[PDB]
Amino acid sequence: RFASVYAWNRKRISNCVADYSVLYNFAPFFAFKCYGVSPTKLNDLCFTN
Amino acid sequence: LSRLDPPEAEVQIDRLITGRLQSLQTYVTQQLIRAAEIRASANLAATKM
């Protein structure tokens, strides 16, 4: 149920242990470039929201 | 450093290090002028003494 561009689907993430390496088995990842965070340096950071 | 990988961290680091140098070079430049002002006063005191 991916929504339209004019009304996108917003989901909030609560307290958990998010490993940003096991999501690689969900999509071919056509574009995966990030902006302010190194994609490799994601399992060593604590996030606010 | 913990958030950005080396390939593009240095781009951000380069802006920081050049910014602090301009802050550091400003400090010493004003110190040199102030030191000259004090030395003129110290010379005046020595002549006065």
With contacts defined as CB-CB under 8 Å, which chain A residues touch B2? 41, 44-45
- Looking up tokens 């110190």, which residue turns up? B31
Experimentally, the structure was elucidated by cryo-EM
Alpha-carbon gap, residue A47 to A49, rounded angstroms? 6
- Looking up tokens 């030395």, which residue turns up? B39
DSSP strands (E only) in B1-49:
none
Alpha-carbon gap, residue A33 to B15, rounded angstroms? 22
Show the DSSP H helices in B1-49 as ranges: 6-48
CB pairs under 8 A between A and B: 16
CB of B13 within 8 Å of a chain A CB? The answer is no
